[PDB]
Amino acid sequence: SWQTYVDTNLVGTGAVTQAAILGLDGNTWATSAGFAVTPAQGQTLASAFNNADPIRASGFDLAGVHYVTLRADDRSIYGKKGSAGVITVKTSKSILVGVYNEKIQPGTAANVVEKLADYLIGQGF
């Protein structure tokens, strides 16, 4: 199911320390050990993909960590907190959340998230 993508293709690459797969309702379909995106944080992110405005001035929360919004559009939402950050990408039916920390190059983490997203969109997800 989606848990393979979280364990192998996302956290397994060592490019992200935490990750989850959400449906468009903001609910979790698969999450890494201990990573918990509350449905409310999930729904807040899911809507941001339509109306980013509410997320731009005050950022957004994800599992107890608050991030400032760097860029947000119809496909991806990037945020950060010092040297940590998260790449969130929307596919046709899900939302990929990939968190990284100060030991990971943000560019390396965007490469993995944006491309897995491209791969699932290609499979029709």
Swiss-Prot record:
Pfam families: Profilin. Residues 1-35 are annotated as: Actin binding. Binds to actin and affects the structure of the cytoskeleton. At high concentrations, profilin prevents the polymerization of actin, whereas it enhances it at low concentrations. By binding to PIP2, it inhibits the formation of IP3 and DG. Its main location: cytoplasm. One of its GO terms (molecular function) is actin monomer binding. The record marks 115 as: Actin binding. The modification N6,N6,N6-trimethyllysine is found at residue 103. This is Profilin-1A. Occurs in many kinds of cells as a complex with monomeric actin in a 1:1 ratio. Gene3D superfamilies: Dynein light chain 2a, cytoplasmic. The lineage of its organism: Eukaryota, Amoebozoa, Discosea, Longamoebia, Centramoebida. GO terms for biological process: actin cytoskeleton organization.
